[PDB]
């Protein structure tokens, strides 16, 4: 060969390897992360992300009076000076004390001794995994990370001679590290469990760390979340000494009537993984975190003060990390605390960073979730990203409440507020900011997920399961309500989702019917526990070895296996194999006898019924094995033992056919 | 100048770029990180890394009684039972 063609192949190998290495660099630094699931519990009755979306889209104001069951002296601790507060309402999770201790194995003793932050975070993580199409029980042993933005709000009060009831568990139940650790301990996750203390920026920083961990291959999937609960009202009293809380409790984000910032509770978690991994594993992608950035301000006018320069710098860093121009995004979930000091600085930072060269007909639309539920605290950024995710999913930006007029402290004359809802060539992108009080500014950029059949198996079972019968009834009722609001779902898809993407718990039930007119009533009868024809219920055994049983005669009836021959191809193949084995030792074909072909002998004759029974039994047992039920033992009854002898492997198909046929003939 | 001369330079540039890219991959995956500064204030009168080195090298056990300038009810806290409510059984520890 010539030298030129020889060196050409080496050049081709070299440039292909160069492209591979460059692509490795690109996916090792600027990898888009996929939000495959999410779960939030925020004030205003919100329990699911859909609850959040219907709350924020409707414009509901989820601020109400202080809780009365928490032991607070609510009538006494209100004074519109020395140690009181001038606000009587904020965003609260009145069910924050509610937790399913038994489901996660937690004891009531540990549960009451445990911080409600951990209690909310466990359930939120489990729901986030479930909403991703993943079975949490199957996540055991995987290299799954856990990154929680939490803080020691104070539930056991370590500085006050911790109570007798919560003695021994006030470390395990209240260390902020254990908030992230307990998720991995219960779910059996193997990736690092790191909790982040950054005040009002911890959750978005946790999302950043999860993204970096996934990009480096340290994790396969990750839990990026935050939690905020208020065991005591001190957060209102300490921030009431300085006029930082709004007098009425409304976070008038970026409004001329901005006069303070009311705090709020809430938990919000995301289950995320690499976009390529999501595409390979066939997980549904809700949104795509393209880039992230975090920094500090440092030289701020006071420790607990903002800085427009730092916010602009983190915004630009997040834009550059994602490789996106500022004009690419058409929405921002601003922090929007509502403070008179904070709002103008944040608006100036957003205007300087994002809106500087945008078109003259596509202003940046700024809103805040804090106007609806108040300042969530640690869980603010990871709730704002959920809000933007559902805004992209539904293609409409919800309005931000309590904006009577844009605040005059900033020159808007580029960027506009979301006074009323607005609807939406290129993928939808939106930024989220989680600027903190400790100076740790954070920012993420999300993008719309990229655009992503088989014949329907008949009589697909619908499977339900729960730890307790009451939980099973609740599951049935919830599924019935969900299916009511859906335009004609595919039953086989529901069967697949229920069977694969949900844990098999102890108390189980099943619905097996081939018509879409009985499943609804069956689900209802499961809900109130009434019986139904197409409904099965039971208590699964923890352990036990399986047996196949092969009776003798008696289990015959004309037409048996006829429908299975057409419908089930595996049964047809097994019957064909049995027929080929039997042909040499008999003067007719099995398929003719089973199908009732004209002239074939009936089951009255002893010599034909027994081979037919043997073949049908062997084919059915092999079908059971094909469906994954491998027996641990086999037992027979007279001629049935021959069939058992075939399934045990002692006798080949030919030998078993010979024995049964000649034995019947004799 | 024919193709044999021409393709050799392209191959050299391509493999140099390949080496640079592989070096970059190693440089943002397993870079060695240098500890340029150190500071510590561990118990036993340690105020610097040299203090800790002197402590460990000399085989010093820096375990002493509780601090008496923190409002701790040290006398009514010993209780050698390991089960009584809100009481230790450890008299000494490494206190800064």
């Amino acid at each position, epitope marked *: 060969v010539t030298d030129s063609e020889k*060196v050409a*192949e*080496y050049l081709r*190998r*070299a440039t292909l390897d160069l492209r*591979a290495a460059r692509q490795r660099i690109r996916e090792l630094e600027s990898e888009p992360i996929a939000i495959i699931g999410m779960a939030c519990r925020l004030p205003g009755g919100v329990d699911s992300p859909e609850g959040l979306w219907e709350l924020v889209d409707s414009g509901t104001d989820a601020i109400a009076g202080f809780p009365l069951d928490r032991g607070w002296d609510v009538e006494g601790m209100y004074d519109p000076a020395p140690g009181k507060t001038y606000v009587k309402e904020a965003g609260f999770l009145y069910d924050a004390g509610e937790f399913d201790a038994g489901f996660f194995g937690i004891s009531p003793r540990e549960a009451v001794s445990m911080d409600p932050q951990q209690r909310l975070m466990l359930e939120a993580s489990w729901e986030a995994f479930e909403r991703a199409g993943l079975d949490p029980a199957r996540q055991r042993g995987t290299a799954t990370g856990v990154f929680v933005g939490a803080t020691a709000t104070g539930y056991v009060s370590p500085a006050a001679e911790v109570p007798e009831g919560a003695e021994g568990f006030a470390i395990t139940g209240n260390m902020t590290a254990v908030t992230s650790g307990r998720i991995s301990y219960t779910l059996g996750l193997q990736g690092p469990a790191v909790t982040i203390d950054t005040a009002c920026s911890s959750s978005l920083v946790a999302l950043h760390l999860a993204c970096q961990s996934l990009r480096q291959g340290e994790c396969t999937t990750a839990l990026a979340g935050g939690v905020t609960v208020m065991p005591t009202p001190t957060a209102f009293t300490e921030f009431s000494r300085q006029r930082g809380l709004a007098p009425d409790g409304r976070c008038k984000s970026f409004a001329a009537a901005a006069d303070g910032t009311n705090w709020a509770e809430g938990v919000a978690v995301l289950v995320v993984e690499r976009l390529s991994d999501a595409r390979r594993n066939g997980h549904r992608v809700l949104a795509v975190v393209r880039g992230t950035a975090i920094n500090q301000d440092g030289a701020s006018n006071g420790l607990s003060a903002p800085n427009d320069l730092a916010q602009e710098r983190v915004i630009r860093s997040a834009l550059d990390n994602a490789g996106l121009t500022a004009s690419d995004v058409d929405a921002v979930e601003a922090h929007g605390t509502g403070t008179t000091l904070g709002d103008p600085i944040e608006a100036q930072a957003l205007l300087a960073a994002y809106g500087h060269e945008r078109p003259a007909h596509r202003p940046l639309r700024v809103g805040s979730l804090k106007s609806n539920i108040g300042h969530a605290g640690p869980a603010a950024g990871v709730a704002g990203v959920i809000k933007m995710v559902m805004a992209m999913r539904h293609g409409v930006l919800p309005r931000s409440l309590h904006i009577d007029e844009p605040t005059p402290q900033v020159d808007w004359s580029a960027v506009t507020l979301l006074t009323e809802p607005v609807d939406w060539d290129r993928p939808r992108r939106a930024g989220v900011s989680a600027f903190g009080i400790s100076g740790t500014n954070a920012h993420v950029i999300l993008e719309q997920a990229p655009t992503q059949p088989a014949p329907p198996v008949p009589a697909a079972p619908w499977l339900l399961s729960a730890k307790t019968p009451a939980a099973l009834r609740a599951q049935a009722r919830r599924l019935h309500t969900h299916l009511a609001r859906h335009p004609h779902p595919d039953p086989t898809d529901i069967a697949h989702a229920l069977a694969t993407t949900r844990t098999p718990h102890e108390h189980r039930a099943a619905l097996v019917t081939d018509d879409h007119g009985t499943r609804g009533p069956a689900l209802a009868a499961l809900a109130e526990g009434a019986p139904d024809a197409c409904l099965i219920s039971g208590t699964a055994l923890s352990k036990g070895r399986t047996v196949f049983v092969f009776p003798g005669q008696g289990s015959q009836w004309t037409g048996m296996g006829r429908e299975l021959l057409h419908t089930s191809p595996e049964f047809a193949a097994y019957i064909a194999e049995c027929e080929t084995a039997l042909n040499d030792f008999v003067d007719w074909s099995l398929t003719d006898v089973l199908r009732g072909t004209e002239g074939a002998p009936g089951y009255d004759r002893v010599d034909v019924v027994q081979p037919a029974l043997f073949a049908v039994m062997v084919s059915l047992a092999r079908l059971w094995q094909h469906h994954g039920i491998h027996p641990d033992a086999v037992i027979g009854h007279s001629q049935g033992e021959i069939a058992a002898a075939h399934i045990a492997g002692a006798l080949s198909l030919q030998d078993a056919a010979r024995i049964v046929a000649l034995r019947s003939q004799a | 100048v024919t193709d044999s001369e021409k393709v*050799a330079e392209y191959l050299r540039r391509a493999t140099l770029d390949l080496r640079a890219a592989r070096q970059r991959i190693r440089e943002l995956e397993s870079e060695p990180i240098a500890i340029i500064g150190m500071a510590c204030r561990l118990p036993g009168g340690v105020d610097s890394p040299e203090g800790l080195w002197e402590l460990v090298d000399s085989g010093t056990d820096a375990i002493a009684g509780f601090p008496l300038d923190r409002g701790w009810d040290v006398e009514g806290m010993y209780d050698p039972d390991a089960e009584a409510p809100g009481k230790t059984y450890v008299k000494e520890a490494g206190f800064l």
Partner: antibody
Amino acid sequence: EVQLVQSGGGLVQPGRSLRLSCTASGFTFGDYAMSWVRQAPGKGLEWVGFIRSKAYGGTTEYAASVKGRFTISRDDSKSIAYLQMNSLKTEDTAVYYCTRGGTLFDYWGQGTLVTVSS
Amino acid sequence: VVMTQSPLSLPVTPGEPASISCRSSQSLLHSNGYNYLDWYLQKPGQSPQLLIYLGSNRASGVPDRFSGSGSGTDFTLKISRVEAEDVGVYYCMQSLQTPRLTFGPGTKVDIKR
């Protein structure tokens, strides 16, 4: 993702023709020079032949032991390499491997076990 | 004619590196400053695969532990970490002179005990 899949083996008595097809999927098949390399049972690798790309001319070269008897062709439209083995001898039993690149065998096929005897 | 020779066999163990050396009968360093040599691996039951080309340039997808080195007549393939998956036959095969009649006897690699 580059893939090479061979086929067309099977038992053959000596002294007849045979065809080995090898389909390529995952790269520009036209530009590459394409090679066949056999390996007898227990022996080392032994190059059989190769064909240049259609741009270079598409000419073929073969190992010294296979002058005339063996032939190489390529369907560039559907991107398959064909090894036509005419007048097989008893010592041609081997595992014929399908490879990309005339001089540098960067990727190799699964290999087709062609056994020949009377 | 150019001739290349390597050790017939080299037992190895997982726990300590190894180096498969081989020498040519001629200076393989082409006028363009490249040693026209390649290194291939053939695992038991799998097809041969490329490891190194032009003496030291590693192919993409190969483990980084492999590394080609040397020049002129003398070349080596150094493996930092030995694994059971890497057992097989290693062929150092020249390309300065064409056509190549055969790969050569190779160098069997096996678990040492």
